[PDB]
Ligand binder design. Structure first.
Ligand code: CLR
Ligand code: CLR
Ligand code: CLR
Ligand code: CLR
Lengths: 247, 247, 247, 247
């Protein structure tokens, strides 16, 4: 059904292009503080700058392509919307493929642009010194939990009290996740964004954390919103049919 | 009445979960600058980072659960809404219990994740050197006064001139309170959030400030908004019945 | 006419209280980086923190009391709205008196709170090294010009394309003014806000700038909006009657 | 036709004045970290401060002159709106002339105000060390691509899912571009902004980047939004008539 519709593939291309722009802008801001190359200064990474870069990139690209693709730009957000039965399995898989490919393309272009940097890690997510696998996993879980919870609540379609900009809300949620998680894990929070850096730098050490934790956080947010706090008066059988229908 | 309504208990569970997420994300962001552990560096706390963490946490969680519970997430805001005769006594008590227990749970999990920090104060609010109990009390009073005043004016329901995101407004008020009070008192203003850190660290020195100042500030905000600036044309006899009925 | 109305004096008290809260919170955030007092550290003032403090203070207080008083909180803004003939002369006079008194009271209370700071300037506005009277005057004129222009455009009442939060718009304008002018003059931008610090510290050197420049900027913004960009097709004789009628 | 209309010339004057205010305030905030002059301190530029200055200046001036001129304030945005056939060729040319002249005027006044800085580059855009022409070109292309894409998607007039403040959305897009590109190229992103600095400082080294890259980014944004993501159901022949008609 969705395979033969041009609106679906425009949405997939929108996901690819917006993910590329998001990853490029955000990881470019994360690599900004290392410049100039020659100038030997005790340059310290600005966490507010990087968090605002990721968050405002999400806000701007959501404002740009929300009416076209839903402005997911995150495999965990897409999986959360899948488990809340809002999107089909095929749309979820195509969105995840598009997001990962767009992140890989953006990170390759960024490796080209930042070629003067020696030891260019391309913003690859890894555990800080003092944070082990479980602690970083919990960091990723909570960050993605708040993100997917905000995404689910913003698009309930039963809410008449909603006001203001939904893209701004999702962007500030991403920025909040970064303000939490940058000092602990670099704030993957987005499996495609971490996957692109891991692929380009050929380093997948502890990379399973940044795929497992965000998915657990998305599942927990789905459970919290759709089975504890704001349940829907609809049978699970009718909702599951969206997986094969997309309705 | 409210005791036998499932929607009331959904709201209470929403307050518990959202306060847990708020405390965890905000204090974990406040503890970020102490990482890495092995790296001997004279790192300083970035106050904008922590203020934005608290503010955007409040804004995001308000967007998530405000239509479910009102998203108080602050015993001062709950007491202000009780004193403005908008909620019942039972709802206020259940909200305060849920917020405090959720804060304790979040701080326990956070001390679990940040166990590598030696002498971890877990974001416990304490007076800065040069500030006595009275000065920190005044700072807390003013921060809570502005926060509760913004909450009361945002939910007036007699206003048609409101626009934009009310969760964003309340979050930016929380961030304003933090931009004020982080340097002076570690920025409490939320008695549950202070209480969780005090319980986990087993340290209650000067803890009366962060329960008295927020309550005085909330009560003063109620007085200002309901009996100086925006009086209601209702007898107090009708408004008192909201305490026992919850209407 | 307005002398014998309860709503008029409620608005005046709202202006007084909101100016008190604004001056207190913002200047207290400006002084925060000096704490702890005992610790001998070369901490540097964070311009983003102070600018966000002023801006979020204006935004929060506008969201609180704009429906009551209009949330001017600035003698330059009040003078601009008088020259654009939106308020009466008596309302402008009482608003400016209330704003100055509130700033004086807030600065007194904050000086009481920040007594342990030796050589405390209380955020007194003065020129930096390398900036003479003319350059600081120009910076103040431009900052207040953009502030008053935003206020005039946001309250046009002929506009149907206005969206989002007007208090947030005015607050971000104030934050922008501080981002421009903190390094040059400390960003007076607000004659009452500087007048309070000058009165409490008993230092009026170069203080004519912060009462001349903001008023010039307000008058220029009135000229730009009401006579160049979006003129009103109403007689100047008719708009004169607003000064003595308020309608 | 449009040459003799009062509203057209009001829009042109609004573009000139708002571009003057934008350039002045943003580049004044950019040069502020070098003050005080006498104090010998190793001051480091705050990228968040300058990025927020640019973005909030764009948001405030859009809120001020959007209903009069559309608030481009950027030759790349004007070129994008021309190529998407939203304005005429005459309007676009007059807008670009006004923006360049306003940037020149603002930079001249600012060099008058920042005269005490020795070797004052007036925030002139140039490549950082480690960045050659291709890398800076790519950075400028991507930043302007995201900006123009956000502008095109925001002013669509076919969308009913838009909420919040469009000026704030465009301002956050500008701030995001600066957060990305300040460390690499100073974030031209705006050919008029770079042009004024280059003209006043009499230095055009690599100045072609900040005219070509923004225009390439705007053209790519127009291509992406109009012929990949959200095509319009009209013939190109009908849309071309806007170039000579303005309707
Ligand atoms: C909020 C919940 C549901 C998600 C996060 C919980 C998990 C991932 C976290 C939170 C608390 C964590 C534990 C807390 C304390 C310690 C002791 C330390 O010496 C080794 C790791 C260990 C054993 C942590 C492992 C991972 C852990 C269990
Ligand atoms: C809105 C109100 C209730 C909050 C602020 C008022 C209170 C808490 C503040 C404002 C004035 C303050 C006092 C002002 C001056 C001093 C002198 C100093 O050597 C010791 C502290 C002391 C005695 C302060 C204690 C705290 C204080 C009383
Ligand atoms: C648009 C206008 C009205 C706003 C600001 C303009 C005024 C206040 C500013 C801008 C340019 C400034 C001048 C620029 C250069 C100098 C040389 C310096 O050695 C003494 C001050 C003096 C003479 C400045 C005085 C103040 C000045 C005239
Ligand atoms: C995505 C598009 C629209 C914008 C960015 C693409 C262009 C401008 C980028 C992408 C790849 C880049 C190249 C990657 C690698 C190199 C080798 C290096 O030693 C010099 C720069 C140079 C030659 C770069 C020049 C700029 C470049 C061609």
């Amino acid at each position: 059904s969705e395979f033969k519709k041009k609106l679906f593939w425009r949405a997939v291309v929108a996901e690819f292009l917006a993910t590329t722009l998001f990853v490029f802008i955000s990881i470019g801001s994360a690599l900004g503080f290392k410049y100039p190359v020659g100038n030997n200064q005790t340059a310290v990474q600005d966490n507010v700058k990087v968090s605002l870069a990721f968050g405002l990139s999400i806000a701007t690209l959501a404002q740009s392509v929300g009416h076209i693709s839903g402005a997911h730009l995150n495999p965990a957000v897409t999986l959360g919307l899948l488990l809340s039965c809002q999107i089909s399995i095929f749309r979820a898989l195509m969105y995840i493929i598009a997001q990962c490919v767009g992140a890989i393309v953006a990170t390759a272009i960024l490796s080209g642009i930042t070629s003067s940097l020696t030891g260019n890690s391309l913003g690859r997510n890894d555990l800080a010194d003092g944070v082990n696998s479980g602690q970083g996993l919990g960091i990723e879980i909570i960050g993605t939990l708040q993100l997917v919870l905000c995404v689910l609540a913003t698009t309930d379609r039963r809410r008449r009290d909603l006001g203001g900009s939904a893209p701004l809300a999702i962007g500030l949620s991403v920025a909040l996740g970064h303000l939490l998680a940058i000092d602990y894990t670099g704030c993957g929070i987005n499996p495609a964004r971490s996957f692109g850096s891991a692929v380009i730098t050929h380093n997948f050490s502890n990379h399973w954390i940044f795929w497992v934790g965000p998915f657990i956080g998305g599942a927990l947010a789905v459970l919290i919103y759709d089975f504890i706090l704001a349940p829907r008066s609809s049978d699970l059988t009718d909702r599951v049919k969206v997986w094969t229908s997309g309705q």
